[PDB]
Amino acid sequence: MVTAALTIYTTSWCGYCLRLKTALTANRIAYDEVDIEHNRAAAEFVGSVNGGNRTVPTVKFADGSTLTNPSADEVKAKLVKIAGLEHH
């Protein structure tokens, strides 16, 4: 029942993504990471949301908006408003 409201794009080819991924996990933020490395249809979509690039730690919220390389603070403050929980 842990609702992961964040769709985070990840790969095994990682570095900078892991930084944010560690931050969000330590911040008790539930996220769902994508299969794009193996799952091609979603990989192409990364290129779409970044705009010709495929930046790893791209997060798409339940809001539909994507944040390419966000700060953990932003994510957490956006999470609390879009989920309407853990806000207070």
In angstroms, how far is the first alpha carbon of the chain from the final one?
A: 20
- Hunting for tokens 């969000």 — which residue is that? 24
Q: Where are the domains of the chain?
A: 1-88
Looking up tokens 């290129």 gives: 47
Length of the chain: 88
Distance CA 48, CA 18 (A): 22
Q: How far is CA 41 from CA 3, 18, 24, 30, 34, in A?
A: 23, 23, 26, 23, 11
Label residue 59 exposed, middle or buried (CB < 10 Å: 0-12, 13-18, 19+).
buried
CA distances 57 to 81, 86, 87, 88, Å, are 21, 23, 24, 27
Structure tokens at 29: 């933020």
The CATH architecture one would assign to domain 1-88 is: 3-Layer(aba) Sandwich (3.40)
- Six-digit token pair at 47? 């290129």
All residues at 6 or more sequence positions from 5 whose CB lies less than 8 Å from its CB, including other chains: 30, 31, 61, 62, 79, 82, 83
